[PDB]
Every structure is written in structure tokens, then in C-alpha cells.
Swiss-Prot record, chain A:
Similarity remark: Belongs to the nucleoporin Nup85 family.
Protein name according to UniProt: Nucleoporin NUP85
Superkingdom per UniProt: Eukaryota
Subunit structure: Component of the nuclear pore complex (NPC). NPC constitutes the exclusive means of nucleocytoplasmic transport. NPCs allow the passive diffusion of ions and small molecules and the active, nuclear transport receptor-mediated bidirectional transport of macromolecules such as proteins, RNAs, ribonucleoparticles (RNPs), and ribosomal subunits across the nuclear envelope. Due to its 8-fold rotational symmetry, all subunits are present with 8 copies or multiples thereof.
Organism name: Saccharomyces cerevisiae (strain ATCC 204508 / S288c) (Baker's yeast)
UniProtKB/Swiss-Prot annotation, chain B:
Protein name (database record): Nucleoporin NUP120
The protein's assembly and partners: Component of the nuclear pore complex (NPC). NPC constitutes the exclusive means of nucleocytoplasmic transport. NPCs allow the passive diffusion of ions and small molecules and the active, nuclear transport receptor-mediated bidirectional transport of macromolecules such as proteins, RNAs, ribonucleoparticles (RNPs), and ribosomal subunits across the nuclear envelope. Due to its 8-fold rotational symmetry, all subunits are present with 8 copies or multiples thereof.
Residues represented out of the complete protein: 777 to 1036 of 1037
Superkingdom: Eukaryota
Compartmental location: Nucleus, Nuclear pore complex; Nucleus membrane
Protein purpose: Functions as a component of the nuclear pore complex (NPC). NPC components, collectively referred to as nucleoporins (NUPs), can play the role of both NPC structural components and of docking or interaction partners for transiently associated nuclear transport factors. NUP120 is involved in nuclear poly(A)+ RNA and pre-ribosome export, in GSP1 nuclear import, in NPC assembly and distribution, as well as in nuclear envelope organization.
Gene responsible for this protein: NUP120
Amino acid sequence: IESIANFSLVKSYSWLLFEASCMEGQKVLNAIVSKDDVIIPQDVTNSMRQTLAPYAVLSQFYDREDWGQALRLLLLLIEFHYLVLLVAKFLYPIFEDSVATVIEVIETKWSNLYETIIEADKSATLLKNLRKKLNFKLCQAFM
Amino acid sequence: FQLHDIWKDLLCTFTVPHSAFYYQLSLLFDQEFALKCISKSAEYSLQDFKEKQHIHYLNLLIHFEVLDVLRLGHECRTNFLQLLLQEDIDFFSTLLRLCNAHSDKIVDSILSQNLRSCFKKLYCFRMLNAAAEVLYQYILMIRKRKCYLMVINVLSVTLTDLRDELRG
């Protein structure tokens, strides 16, 4: 882990980014040293993505901020299967127009590792996703 | 008065002898006392009398929940209710939303008819929870993208067509 941290060719960097994302989802000095960043997220690329993820986690730890974070997450998923599943899991836990649009785009975008991740999260996925989408739509209608 | 048990109205009330009294007081102060008494009597009682009481109560509450109560009461004079709902149409919408949230025949039909008489589509869709999709498609025949997106979200053949249209 330390060697990989020291190293941080394109595929390897992408893998490192994915690992960092997984670690952030699970949740020291290197992370602090790592912390313009917002603009890069909207658009080295792996690094920018990881930095965007960290800012999102930070915002999550800190209602509008949560919404901004979720929007960032949806934007990241569009740029990019496991990630989408994690996003859906995050959305279910939280449970206006822009949000609905993002959810729609995600539904439009929607293997073994993903199913394993889903099973780990539960401790069927697509159905739960559709149900959550329906709930969000109802919420938007009520507003 | 309650503990126990203008001249012309008093004479009439005396001839009648609780509902008549509260009705008379309500009419006389027509205000807080009036509304309170009328509401109390209406509650204690629960074709003409019922309707009058309901209308009075609804008006008083809207001047000062009551809508849904009165509606469910009368359901269990249709054109009258149509006129009442006509007067109701933002607060009415909120109340309707609350009722729908609580639930999760004639009333539904009257409601649909009134809503059919952006905003309109949203109201209709919220109430029905197919007509929404039809209305949207008819209107479509930035705006395009929004309409297509809304339809796609609602459905989740049509999706592929919408996607192809947006891509073209």
C-alpha cells in the first residue's frame, strides 16, 4: 500500500484511482498532503477524480451541501459499474429538478464484483434502484 | 349556553328547540365566536343542513385539513363540490398533496375534471398517483429535452424513441 502511494501506466493510475475511491467509500498524512479542484471535477485525471471524491466525503461529513455533493457524484458517474452501484447505495441512504434530471440520466446509463459489492452493501439491486427512483420522483412531485 | 342545553331569528331558534343556535350565532357575527360555535355544532351533529354546515366550516377555516375532512365526509350535491373546489384553486394543492400522502371514485373523477380545466401537468400527475404522458407528448408536438427527460423518468419502446429523437 505504501509503495503504491509512493508511485502515485494509464491503466495503473486508473486502478489506483478506483482503489482510492473504494477506500474513501469505506471511510492519513498522504491524504492531507493531497488536499481549481472543483473545476477539474466538472471536467492527472485520476488524481483530480480522487480529489473530487475526497471533497465530496468532506462535505458529507459536514442539506444544500449534501445536494451539491450528490450532484458531483452523479457528474462523476456520467464521466466514467461498481461506482454506479455505490452511488445508488448512497442515494438510498439519503432517502429538485436538476436532481431528477441526474437520476434520469443514471437510470438511462444503467459484473460479479458489482453484485458482490451490492451483497456487501445489503449486509434485486436494479429493482431497489427503480423503487428508489420512483420514490424520488414522488418526492419531486410533492414539492 | 353549552352548559345549559335579531328578535325574529331568536324566535325561530326558540321554535326549533343545538345546531340552529350555532347557525344563528354564526350568521349574526358574520367573527371568532361565530366560527367556533358553528364548528362545534357541526362536529356534534356529524341534505341541506349538512351542506350548509360544511360550507360554513370550510369558509371559516380558509379564512382563519378542513377541506379533506369535509370532502371525505360528503363523499361517504356534486356540482356544489365542484364550485367549492373551484374556489379552492396553492393551499388547496398542498392539502390535496397531504391527503394523497395519507392514502399511500367520485372524488377522484371530480378532481381530475377540475385539474384538467408545467403547473397543470404537474397537478394532474400528482393526482393520478398515463394522462400526464399524453398531455406532455401533445404539447411537444430546452423544452424538448425537459419533456423527454420527464417522460423517460416516469416510464422507469417509448424510451428508445425519445432517446433517438433527442439524439436527432
